[PDB]
Amino acid sequence: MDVFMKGLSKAKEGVVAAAEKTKQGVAEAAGKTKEGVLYVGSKTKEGVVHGVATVAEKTKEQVTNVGGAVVTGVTAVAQKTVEGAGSIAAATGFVKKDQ
Amino acid sequence: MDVFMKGLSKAKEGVVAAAEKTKQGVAEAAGKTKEGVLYVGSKTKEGVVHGVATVAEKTKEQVTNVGGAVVTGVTAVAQKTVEGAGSIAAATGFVKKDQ
Amino acid sequence: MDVFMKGLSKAKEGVVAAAEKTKQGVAEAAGKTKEGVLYVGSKTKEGVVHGVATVAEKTKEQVTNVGGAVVTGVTAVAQKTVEGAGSIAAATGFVKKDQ
Amino acid sequence: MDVFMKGLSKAKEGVVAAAEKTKQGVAEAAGKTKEGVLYVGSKTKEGVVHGVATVAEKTKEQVTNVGGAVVTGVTAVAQKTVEGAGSIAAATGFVKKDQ
Amino acid sequence: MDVFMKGLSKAKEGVVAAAEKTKQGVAEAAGKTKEGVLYVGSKTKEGVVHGVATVAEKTKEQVTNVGGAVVTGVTAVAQKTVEGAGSIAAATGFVKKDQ
Amino acid sequence: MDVFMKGLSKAKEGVVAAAEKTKQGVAEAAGKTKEGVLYVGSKTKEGVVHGVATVAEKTKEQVTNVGGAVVTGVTAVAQKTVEGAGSIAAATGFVKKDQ
Amino acid sequence: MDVFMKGLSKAKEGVVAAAEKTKQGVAEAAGKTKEGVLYVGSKTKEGVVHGVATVAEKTKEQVTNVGGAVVTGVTAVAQKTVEGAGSIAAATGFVKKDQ
Amino acid sequence: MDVFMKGLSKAKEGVVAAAEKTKQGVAEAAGKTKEGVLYVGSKTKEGVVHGVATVAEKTKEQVTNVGGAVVTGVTAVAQKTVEGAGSIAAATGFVKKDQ
Amino acid sequence: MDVFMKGLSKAKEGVVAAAEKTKQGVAEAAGKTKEGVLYVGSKTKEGVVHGVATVAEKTKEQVTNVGGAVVTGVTAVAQKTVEGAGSIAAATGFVKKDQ
Amino acid sequence: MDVFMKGLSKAKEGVVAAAEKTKQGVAEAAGKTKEGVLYVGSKTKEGVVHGVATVAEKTKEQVTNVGGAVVTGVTAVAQKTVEGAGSIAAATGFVKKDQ
């Protein structure tokens, strides 16, 4: 009694080719303020700025001039992944028994 | 009684090729303010700045001039991953028994 | 009774090729303010700056001129990973029994 | 009764090729303000600056001129990882029994 | 009853090739303000500067001119890892029994 | 927001009387050959006798005479638990505010 | 936000009386051949006798005469637990505010 | 934010009376051949006798006469636990504020 | 933020009475052949006798006469635990504020 | 932020009475052949006798006559633990503020 996963049993001349969570020619960008955090009975005053900010608690005037460019953000480019003859493979198996 | 995973049993002439969490030609950028943090009965006043900031608690004037460029963020480029004949493989198995 | 993982049992002439968390031609950049931190009954006033900042608690004037460029952030470039004939492989196995 | 992982049992003429957390041609850059820290009943006033800052607790004027360039951040470039014929391999196994 | 990991049992003519946490042609740069620190009932006023800073507790004026370039950060370049015929391998095993 | 169990919240003049897995005047007898055992790939030839036994692997004659009494087993007697005025209580609470 | 168990919150003049796994006037007898044992790849030939036994591996005759009494087993008697006025209590709480 | 167990919070004039795994007037008898044992790759030939035994590996005759009494086993008697006025208590708490 | 167990917080005039694993008038008898033992790659031939035994490896005759009494076992008697007025208490707390 | 156990915090006029693993009027008898032993690659031939034994490796006759009494075992008696007015207490606390 075989109990299995992502594989074989019996099967003389058996090939198991397993790719799991595999990346090839991959452009991953992640911008994350809070990933996997736990707050138990806490009291915070967090603040995050990407770009230009003019922060004050108590003030009288606040001027924020943007005459230029404020470019921000998460960017991911995957270009010309396979150019030419090329080959990208994942979990490739075979049995050749030519005569 | 075989209990298994990502593999084989019996199968004379058996090949197991397993790729797990494999990267090839991969551009990963991560910008993360808080990953995996725990706060138990704490009291914080955190602050993070990416770019230009003009921070004050008590003030009277605040001027933030951006006549130029403020470029920020998470960027990932994967370009020309396989140029030419090329070969990227993961978890490749085979049995050749040619006569 | 075999209990296994990422492998084989029985299978005369068996090959196990396992790649786990493998990187090849990989550009990983990580910018992280807090990774895996624990705060138990603490009281902090943290502050992080990437770029230009003008910080004060008590002040009267605050001017932040950016006439130039403020470039910041997490960048990862993977370019021309395999140029030419080339070969990148992970977890490659085979049995050759040619006659 | 065999209990195993990333390997084989029985299998006369067996090859186990295991790569775990392997890097080849990898450009990893990490910029991290706090990794794996513990605060138990503590009281801190931390501050980190990457770039230009103008910090004061009590002041009257604060001018921050950036007429030039303030370039900062975490960068990772993996270029031309395999140029030419080339070969990068991880966890490569085989059995050759040619006649 | 064999209990093992990253290896084989039985298997006359057996090869075990194991690479764990191996680096080849790897450019790793780490810039970390605090890695693995513990604070138990402590009271600190830490401050770290990468670049230009103008710090004061009590002051009246603060001018920070950047007419030039302030370049900072964590950089890692892996270029032309395998140029030419070349060979990088990790955890390579085989059995050859040619006749 | 109170999240609780086997108790109260608010309720000025509150009594919580909790008895859990409490025994009073209890006769517990347990006769158990195997409680909470684990066998992983083992090979045993166990044998337990309560009373009279005549055990042999290889023999020619076997006579077992019981002219008397063979009394065995698990017995538990709880008699006259509360004789007389008596009092057995568990998890008893009250508020008395008589005028 | 109170998260609790077997107790109270708020409740001026609060009593918490908790009895857990408490025994009073309890007769517990346990006869157990194997409690909480682990066998990993072992090979045993255990044997336990309570009473009379006539054990042999290789023999020719075996006579077991029981003309008397063989009394065995697990016995637990709890008799006259509370005789007379008496008092057995567990987890008893109260608030008395008589005027 | 209170996180607790077997107790109280707030509750001016609070009493916590906690009895855990408490015995009073308790007769516990335990007869156990093996409690909490571990066998890793071992080979034993254990044998335990309570009473009369006639053990041999190789023999020719075996006679076991029991003309008398063989009394064995685990016994626990709890008798007259509270005789008379008496008092057994566990985890008893109260607040008395009589006027 | 209070995180506690078997106790109280706030609660002016607070009493914590905690009894854990307490015995009073307790008769505990334990007869155990093996408690908490570890066998790693060992080979034993243990043997324990409580009562009468007639042990041999190689023999020709074996006679075991029991004309008398063989009394054995684990016994625990708790009798007249509280005789008379008496008092047994565990984890008793109170607040008395009578006027 | 108080993190505690078996005690109190705040609570002016606070009493903590803690009894842990306390015995009073307790009769504990333990008969144990092996408690807490470790065997690593050892080879033993242990043997324990409580009572009468007739042990031989190689013999021809073996007679074991028990015309008398063989009394053995683990016995524990706790009798008349509190006779008379009496008092046994454990973890008793109180606050008395009578007017």
Short mmCIF file of C-alpha atoms in Angstrom, two decimals, chain C, chain D:
data_model
loop_
_atom_site.label_atom_id
_atom_site.label_comp_id
_atom_site.label_asym_id
_atom_site.label_seq_id
_atom_site.Cartn_x
_atom_site.Cartn_y
_atom_site.Cartn_z
CA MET C 1 7.95 0.13 5.02
CA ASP C 2 9.86 3.12 3.62
CA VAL C 3 8.85 6.63 4.68
CA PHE C 4 10.86 9.16 2.71
CA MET C 5 10.90 12.45 0.83
CA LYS C 6 12.82 13.82 -2.17
CA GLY C 7 14.33 10.45 -2.91
CA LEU C 8 13.75 6.89 -3.99
CA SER C 9 13.69 3.37 -2.58
CA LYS C 10 14.33 0.02 -4.28
CA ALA C 11 15.09 1.13 -7.89
CA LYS C 12 18.40 -0.44 -8.81
CA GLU C 13 20.35 2.15 -10.81
CA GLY C 14 18.65 5.08 -9.09
CA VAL C 15 19.66 8.75 -9.28
CA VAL C 16 18.42 11.44 -6.89
CA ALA C 17 19.26 15.01 -7.90
CA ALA C 18 17.75 17.53 -5.49
CA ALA C 19 18.18 21.31 -5.62
CA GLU C 20 16.54 23.26 -2.84
CA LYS C 21 16.65 27.03 -2.49
CA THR C 22 19.36 27.27 -5.15
CA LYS C 23 20.27 30.50 -6.96
CA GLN C 24 22.06 30.79 -10.31
CA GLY C 25 22.62 34.10 -12.06
CA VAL C 26 20.36 35.77 -9.49
CA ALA C 27 20.39 39.44 -8.49
CA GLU C 28 18.65 39.83 -5.13
CA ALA C 29 18.54 43.21 -3.40
CA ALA C 30 16.72 43.61 -0.09
CA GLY C 31 16.16 46.89 1.69
CA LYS C 32 14.34 46.22 4.94
CA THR C 33 13.95 48.53 7.90
CA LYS C 34 13.01 45.83 10.42
CA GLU C 35 13.18 42.08 9.77
CA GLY C 36 12.41 39.66 12.58
CA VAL C 37 12.42 41.97 15.60
CA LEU C 38 10.66 41.54 18.94
CA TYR C 39 9.48 44.30 21.29
CA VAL C 40 8.31 43.20 24.74
CA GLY C 41 7.24 46.09 26.94
CA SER C 42 9.56 48.55 25.21
CA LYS C 43 9.17 52.22 24.27
CA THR C 44 11.10 53.45 21.24
CA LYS C 45 11.26 56.54 19.03
CA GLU C 46 12.93 55.06 15.97
CA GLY C 47 13.49 56.97 12.75
CA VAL C 48 15.08 55.95 9.44
CA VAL C 49 15.91 58.19 6.48
CA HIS C 50 16.78 57.11 2.95
CA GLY C 51 17.45 60.28 0.98
CA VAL C 52 17.16 63.82 2.31
CA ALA C 53 15.43 64.77 5.54
CA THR C 54 15.07 67.90 7.66
CA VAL C 55 14.07 66.69 11.11
CA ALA C 56 13.44 68.75 14.24
CA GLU C 57 11.36 68.37 17.37
CA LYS C 58 10.91 72.06 18.20
CA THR C 59 11.79 74.62 15.54
CA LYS C 60 10.54 77.80 13.90
CA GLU C 61 11.45 77.43 10.21
CA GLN C 62 12.23 74.43 8.01
CA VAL C 63 13.20 74.73 4.34
CA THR C 64 14.15 71.70 2.24
CA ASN C 65 15.34 72.59 -1.26
CA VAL C 66 15.92 69.78 -3.75
CA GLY C 67 17.18 71.40 -6.92
CA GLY C 68 19.12 68.28 -7.83
CA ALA C 69 18.20 64.61 -7.87
CA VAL C 70 17.50 62.37 -4.89
CA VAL C 71 17.62 58.80 -6.20
CA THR C 72 17.01 55.99 -3.73
CA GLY C 73 15.49 52.55 -3.51
CA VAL C 74 16.09 48.84 -3.89
CA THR C 75 17.27 47.79 -7.35
CA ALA C 76 18.07 44.37 -8.79
CA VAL C 77 19.19 43.75 -12.38
CA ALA C 78 19.79 40.32 -13.92
CA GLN C 79 20.95 40.90 -17.49
CA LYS C 80 22.33 38.50 -20.13
CA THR C 81 22.22 35.62 -17.66
CA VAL C 82 23.15 33.06 -20.35
CA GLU C 83 24.90 34.65 -23.33
CA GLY C 84 26.22 32.31 -26.00
CA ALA C 85 26.07 28.54 -26.04
CA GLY C 86 25.75 28.52 -22.26
CA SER C 87 24.27 26.18 -19.68
CA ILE C 88 22.63 26.66 -16.29
CA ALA C 89 21.20 23.54 -14.68
CA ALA C 90 19.80 22.56 -11.30
CA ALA C 91 18.80 19.09 -10.09
CA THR C 92 19.76 17.25 -13.28
CA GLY C 93 19.88 13.46 -13.18
CA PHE C 94 19.89 10.67 -15.69
CA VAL C 95 20.70 7.03 -16.34
CA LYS C 96 22.36 6.16 -19.64
CA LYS C 97 22.56 2.47 -20.57
CA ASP C 98 23.20 2.63 -24.30
CA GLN C 99 24.23 -0.50 -26.19
CA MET D 1 11.93 0.21 7.53
CA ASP D 2 13.86 3.16 6.09
CA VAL D 3 12.88 6.70 7.09
CA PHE D 4 14.91 9.18 5.08
CA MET D 5 14.98 12.44 3.16
CA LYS D 6 16.91 13.74 0.14
CA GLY D 7 18.40 10.35 -0.55
CA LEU D 8 17.79 6.77 -1.57
CA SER D 9 17.70 3.27 -0.11
CA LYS D 10 18.32 -0.10 -1.75
CA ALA D 11 19.08 0.94 -5.38
CA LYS D 12 22.38 -0.67 -6.28
CA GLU D 13 24.36 1.87 -8.31
CA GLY D 14 22.68 4.85 -6.64
CA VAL D 15 23.72 8.50 -6.88
CA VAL D 16 22.50 11.24 -4.54
CA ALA D 17 23.37 14.79 -5.61
CA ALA D 18 21.88 17.36 -3.23
CA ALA D 19 22.34 21.13 -3.43
CA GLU D 20 20.72 23.13 -0.68
CA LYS D 21 20.85 26.91 -0.38
CA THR D 22 23.57 27.09 -3.05
CA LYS D 23 24.50 30.28 -4.91
CA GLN D 24 26.31 30.50 -8.26
CA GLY D 25 26.89 33.78 -10.06
CA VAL D 26 24.65 35.51 -7.53
CA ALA D 27 24.70 39.20 -6.58
CA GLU D 28 22.96 39.65 -3.23
CA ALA D 29 22.88 43.06 -1.56
CA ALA D 30 21.06 43.52 1.75
CA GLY D 31 20.52 46.83 3.48
CA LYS D 32 18.69 46.23 6.73
CA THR D 33 18.32 48.60 9.66
CA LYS D 34 17.36 45.94 12.22
CA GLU D 35 17.49 42.18 11.63
CA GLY D 36 16.70 39.81 14.48
CA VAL D 37 16.73 42.17 17.45
CA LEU D 38 14.96 41.81 20.80
CA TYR D 39 13.80 44.62 23.10
CA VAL D 40 12.62 43.58 26.57
CA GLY D 41 11.57 46.52 28.72
CA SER D 42 13.91 48.93 26.95
CA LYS D 43 13.55 52.58 25.96
CA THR D 44 15.50 53.75 22.92
CA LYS D 45 15.69 56.81 20.66
CA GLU D 46 17.34 55.26 17.62
CA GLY D 47 17.92 57.11 14.37
CA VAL D 48 19.51 56.02 11.08
CA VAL D 49 20.36 58.22 8.09
CA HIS D 50 21.22 57.07 4.57
CA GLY D 51 21.92 60.20 2.56
CA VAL D 52 21.66 63.77 3.83
CA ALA D 53 19.93 64.78 7.04
CA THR D 54 19.60 67.95 9.11
CA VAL D 55 18.58 66.80 12.58
CA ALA D 56 17.97 68.92 15.67
CA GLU D 57 15.88 68.60 18.80
CA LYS D 58 15.46 72.31 19.58
CA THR D 59 16.36 74.82 16.88
CA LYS D 60 15.14 77.98 15.19
CA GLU D 61 16.05 77.55 11.50
CA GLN D 62 16.81 74.51 9.35
CA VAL D 63 17.79 74.74 5.68
CA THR D 64 18.72 71.67 3.63
CA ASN D 65 19.92 72.49 0.12
CA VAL D 66 20.47 69.64 -2.33
CA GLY D 67 21.75 71.20 -5.52
CA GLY D 68 23.67 68.05 -6.38
CA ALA D 69 22.72 64.39 -6.36
CA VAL D 70 21.99 62.21 -3.35
CA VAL D 71 22.08 58.61 -4.60
CA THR D 72 21.46 55.85 -2.09
CA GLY D 73 19.91 52.42 -1.81
CA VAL D 74 20.47 48.70 -2.14
CA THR D 75 21.65 47.59 -5.58
CA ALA D 76 22.42 44.13 -6.97
CA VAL D 77 23.54 43.45 -10.54
CA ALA D 78 24.12 39.99 -12.02
CA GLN D 79 25.29 40.51 -15.61
CA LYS D 80 26.65 38.06 -18.20
CA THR D 81 26.51 35.21 -15.69
CA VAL D 82 27.42 32.61 -18.33
CA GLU D 83 29.18 34.14 -21.34
CA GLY D 84 30.49 31.74 -23.96
CA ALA D 85 30.31 27.97 -23.95
CA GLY D 86 29.99 28.02 -20.17
CA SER D 87 28.49 25.73 -17.56
CA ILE D 88 26.84 26.27 -14.18
CA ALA D 89 25.39 23.19 -12.52
CA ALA D 90 23.97 22.28 -9.13
CA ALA D 91 22.95 18.83 -7.86
CA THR D 92 23.89 16.93 -11.02
CA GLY D 93 23.99 13.15 -10.86
CA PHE D 94 23.97 10.32 -13.33
CA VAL D 95 24.75 6.66 -13.91
CA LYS D 96 26.41 5.73 -17.21
CA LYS D 97 26.58 2.02 -18.07
CA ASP D 98 27.23 2.12 -21.81
CA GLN D 99 28.23 -1.06 -23.64
#
